[PDB]
Amino acid sequence: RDGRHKLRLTGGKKKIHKKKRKYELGRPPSNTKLGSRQVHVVRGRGRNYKYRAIKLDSGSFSWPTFGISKNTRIIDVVYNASNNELVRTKTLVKNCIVVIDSHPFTTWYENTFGTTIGKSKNIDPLLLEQFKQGRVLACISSRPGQCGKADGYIIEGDELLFYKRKMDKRN
Amino acid sequence: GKGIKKHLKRVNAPSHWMLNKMGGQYAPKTSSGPHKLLESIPLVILLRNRLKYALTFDEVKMILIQKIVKVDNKVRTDCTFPVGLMDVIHITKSNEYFRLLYDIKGRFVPHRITNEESKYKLCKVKKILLRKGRLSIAVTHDGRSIPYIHPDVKVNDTVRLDLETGKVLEHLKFQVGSLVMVTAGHSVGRVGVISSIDKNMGTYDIIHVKDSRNKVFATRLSNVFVIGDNTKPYISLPREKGIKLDIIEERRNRLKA
Amino acid sequence: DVQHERAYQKQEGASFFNSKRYWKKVGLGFATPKEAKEGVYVDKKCPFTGNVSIRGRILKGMVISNKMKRTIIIRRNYLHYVKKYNRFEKRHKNIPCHCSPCFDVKEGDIVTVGQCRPLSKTVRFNVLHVEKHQIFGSARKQFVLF
RNA sequence: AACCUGGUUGAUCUUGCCAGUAGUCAUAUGCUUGUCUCAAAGAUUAAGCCAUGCAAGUGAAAGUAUAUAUAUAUAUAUGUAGAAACUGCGAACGGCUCAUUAAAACAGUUAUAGUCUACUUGACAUUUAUAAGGAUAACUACGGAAAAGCUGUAGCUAAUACUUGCAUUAUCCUUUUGGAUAAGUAUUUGUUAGAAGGAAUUAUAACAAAGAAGUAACACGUAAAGUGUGUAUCAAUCGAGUUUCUGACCUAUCAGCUUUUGAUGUUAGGGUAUUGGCCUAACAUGGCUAUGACGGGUAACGGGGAAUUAGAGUUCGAUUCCGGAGAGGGAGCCUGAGAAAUAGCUACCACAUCUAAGGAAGGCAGCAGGCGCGUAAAUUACCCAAUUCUAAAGAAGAGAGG
RNA sequence: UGUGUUUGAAUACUAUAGCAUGGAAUAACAAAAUUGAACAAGCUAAAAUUUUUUGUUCUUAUUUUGGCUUAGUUACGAUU
């Protein structure tokens, strides 16, 4: 919304002037949770539409090594970079780390390489074990509250290690 | 509340128009269309205030409602439709053809054009865009898209343009030694030849222009319109031909007639 | 080390699946740092490899504070004309400017900054060249004119 | 028109004031006004209040007529007018005031490679078929209330209101020709390739996922194979939001301010039309200050400008153009492209009207006119002929305007 | 016989700041010895060129270019 009612650059105080306009703009935060797809269309200035996802379960997750994407359910939200409240309460944001079902990707790898176009350079053993046990960590990257969908990427190596340490006197 | 301002006062309206102080509260406000508000004439101004083919706005409406006048081979009843810097008006009933040109007094004038030569215009491109499939569209000073243009033509080039098919007869590369018309700025409403181009980095490109009295002046690149070549002027200018007489010379010349 | 913060630090144009960073050419009399190309960092507020648009005015000032993280303050000192006395008076203005993590910046350095795109409330500018220099006494209290 | 006289004394020269004197699109008032042309006119005092009236609507080639009127052809057909009513589009402009607001608003000067943009303009589309599916208003009837721009049932029936939907191009083989294969614009995600701009994560090209909306089931009519209305994307245009730099009246009997509580930076998110502490969490401990910060004052809207000007200057700028603010006070929404609108709505407070006292409706700083205030300010006139605006745009409307 | 004609609606101020722009003076500032930097020579670690065996991957080396260490040599290097 407005900034003119906030403190002056010196730290000084500025009198209230100009009654509130439409186009200063700003609305309540997204609450998007885990549940069957439900969305409300939001009407922005100029008739510009935004899609407010209120519940979703299955997003578009990208295996970036082969650069390929499939729609997959998210099992759980496991770590959030911005704060611990959002992950504990289960509200998605574009820097949530979620867990995805690995089966479409696992099928695609099996079809393409013949053991578990294409680069075919072999997946790393820690990540491969995780794909086998179905506990696949992925990072949300779209903004569900704006675009109506929570779409993400499969994490690996240094991003995997950093977020695993972030996720969990003592050790 | 707030939004689109639909009126134009008499005093506020452009000096170029020649709308006198006592003559009304308002001026006509142009429809969106071929040229910018400051850089155009509506049909009401052209019919009544320039041509004087009507006494009043009502008499202009009586002319317009009929099928008689066509611009760009298109009949128009639209009073505040803007006719821009340079294009061809045909009035079928009086058998008249007018090409729009700048005066030396910085106002738009209708210059009588030959019946055959009415076929074509000379059109400056302002931008040229590649759309899907790597497929060209040029964008003109008069707000027209010219699709499918050859890549030889560049973003300040002028082009001779048919009005029946809407497409190009020939084209002129922007360069030093090209006859140029100034369309805005200090030197507005004059014609010269490009003497020299010097690039300006991150800031306004300035172009040096020579008059036909062999006098040199600077002008900003945005508001110089190529209009012919060193070999020939490409279109029918009015008799004055954009050439600058100073006031003392001009008043003495007027007196000596 | 790196990534002391809660989130991984990355930036667009890394392109390390194909592997054929995002360092820029930046234009207008500024040759892009070698230190941007080879540096340990990766950043978005850096004009030499972030998404910053170096647009509008290009100004000079004198650095007064380097205390803030990633952000530095310049004073631009100048003479204001008073018509009645036909004479000048000292005036000056403080501009908070993004630092760029490639550079070393110290007090009394001259810096050529650009108008660019503001990314924070009081920050406006971003350094395009740091001209290494020094001045006697406190820079904030010192009058240097150019 | 670059300028002065008279006034301290018994007389004198000075300092210094007072007095004359001239101007003022700057007001009042006194007296006088045979004339004509020209023409400011309820700002200064109460952003105090308003009786009555009017100030925003719209149908002449092109949505909807069994109220009705009317000219032809064998009750009925073509047709043409048509109260009314749904529909469409406008009423966000203008007109009014200046309480505010003092680095804000505003002015010059940038930037928007951070975005949105109706009408208009020019480009111009991709995943039941001799042509679709009903349901709803006006309308008919019964009704209810003291009153109201209050409205209840049931029967209908249209639309340009609402909902669907009907083979084309390119790539590979053949060699022209003949086969085969594919096929989403915005927008979003993940992977890359990389005409033009100083600068590119831009144009553009490929991949893998999603993905709006769509591409006419509408109306006229050129032989001395044409047109209207309306539609996605792209660009233009009419604009708009932000945003750079530089520019202010008075005050120190206002010297330290700002940071719980975003103050200042960083990081991560969220929101927004988009940048943004705009909003949240986490992390720093800053940031601003005699080149006067921070407060406080202003009979303070800002500017173009006005007066007096030999030259400097000094005083003045509600007030014909531009930009801002505001519509009793705050707040909140709806509608729409555009309004935090106020002849839009809702609530509270401040007002305040009719009531049959159950309830109902309201906003002159629009134009007249009235009240209050005051030293102080015009007619409830006529008209849309001109000037322009609004529409299904000629012919109708407009206290805009004359 | 159709079709009047010449026209005018000028010129300029339009911040002080900003933008472009020529500059010799006058000012400022920077460059400016507890020893400095201009060059020639040699040593040296880095990169590239030329060479060159191994089928859609793949060795090494001379050489050439940039960086750095050290004895010499300049009209060599401080205004009152």
Added chain:
RNA sequence: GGAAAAACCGUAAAUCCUAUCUUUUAAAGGAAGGAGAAGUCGUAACAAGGUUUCCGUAGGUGAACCUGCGGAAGGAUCAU
């Protein structure tokens, strides 16, 4: 699909309580300053004004003032 109604965050009017600042504005009574009339009491200042003057100061005085202390001449001395 969906009216009324509730609940939850978020805007947030209004009201009241304080706290600080701002503005007029009331008030019995107090204590100043000035204006006026040729007012009462002195005779302070003006000449050595009959104790040269003024300053700073302190204490006294019905006052005007006086006295002390230390300055100056704006002294009546710019002369043993």
Added chain:
RNA sequence: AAAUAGAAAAAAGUAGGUAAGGGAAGUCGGCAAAAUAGAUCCGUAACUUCGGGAAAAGGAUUGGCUCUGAGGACAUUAUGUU
């Protein structure tokens, strides 16, 4: 064990409690009674002999449980025992 016991349970007394709505209007008198009160965190005026006023005024918080962080001693050259 108090210089007694038992049984009954009204008045009245005495030491106590508790009271709707009001809130000192009763009475010479707020007498009585009650309100208040401990800590930690905030915040604190008139006025003053500048030492105070001051616990001013005026606020907030406080349980239980499961954790997180900070504060030692010894001995291996960064690691242990406690």
